[PDB]
Subunit: 147 residues, 3 copies
């Protein structure tokens, strides 16, 4: 059941990003989110079929790059913030939490079955990237994060 559950949560995460993608977004953000949807598709395909790996260092390198890029666009967070703000920002936070949920099950799968570490490392980074994108979307809307 661990594998079935992980496959499902990743699918749920990808669907939530589809909802975020239905919102107005900066071009750079839309492109990243779109590529991520393909990544999650490969990730899901990998958790399922045994002996087949699809997530590589390059995938992790791309997330690290987007993290570095977007974080450089924002001043370090000084105070704790609450999930919300502009609709796109709020949706990004929902995606963030669903990604963390998908991470918990992926970690569960790796604990009871031979699993490559790339999957969990990918969603670990995606969780942090969605947090940052929420901030970007709040600023892009002309607002600020909810403190």
């Amino acid at each position: 059941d661990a594998r079935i559950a992980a496959i499902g949560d990743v699918d749920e995460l990808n669907s939530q990003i589809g909802v975020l993608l239905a919102e107005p977004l900066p071009d750079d953000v839309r492109a990243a989110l779109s590529a991520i949807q393909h990544d999650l598709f490969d990730l899901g395909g990998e958790l399922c079929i045994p002996g087949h790996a699809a997530i590589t260092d390059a995938h992790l390198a791309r997330l690290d790059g987007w993290l570095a890029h977007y974080n450089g666009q924002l001043p370090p967070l000084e105070e704790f913030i609450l999930p919300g703000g502009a609709r796109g920002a709020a949706l990004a936070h929902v995606c963030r939490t669903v990604c963390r949920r998908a991470e918990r099950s992926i970690v569960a799968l790796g604990a009871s079955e031979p699993l490559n570490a790339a999957p969990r490392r990918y969603v670990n980074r995606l969780s942090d990237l969605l947090f940052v994108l929420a901030r970007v979307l709040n600023r892009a809307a002309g607002g600020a994060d909810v403190l």
Copy 2:
């Protein structure tokens, strides 16, 4: 010592379709909750502009999911019948017939309505997992699992229909 009066359920339990009391983390309660969550997500979908037939089907499905939750609330009860399953089969055939052959894989998204349909789809599959988990701890007729299994496929097809309609 809390000075706040207790409310039903404060002790971490909830009542079933009888005098039965169970702890909220019980497999049966999780199954009931996930079906409720799925129904709520469909409610969000119903707040979108929709083609007439799609709305009629989803509206009807909410009543079915209510009955399904009811069936799970009463261990010794059965609300979902083959008639419910049969109706989902009919909808599947009806809508699949409206759509052209699916040659390549597709990612969840598109118009907001289609995107929400995919969320309903994944939440429906999550509810199916909880219902399956319930069957591992208690005897359970198949109608519930069969219903949600069929519904997740329908939601997939409806997502495609909604994109077409939403452009």
Copy 3:
């Protein structure tokens, strides 16, 4: 792997006392579900809402942040009778504005009302996680009693939002 290690890459997460637990631990699941709930409320808050309802939901977001903190920080409590009293107050406040529910309702209606019902179900989900956690770890009753009341309040608010939209509750 030629990729540098990031905090959490090993499948664990840090608690407030510096200790680290695997991410599938029951405690992390409860913290996560509370976080998910707070995020859904944030989506509801992005909708057009009556000012009193917005003020209430915004305050609740602060409570849930504190609630998550209590679950994450050992030797740290944050939810008190005051928090539970405020919820009871809002429940009495809003229920009094509505006619008695004579029949079962389906989750949905106006967009804001539908989203409130989603929050309600995610809240119940978080409650199941908090309960599972307290089943193997010493927990104050407060967190559990808080989300227990919040679930009912989100149901009530859903009805309020359907009223405000001039619509009604789906039967």
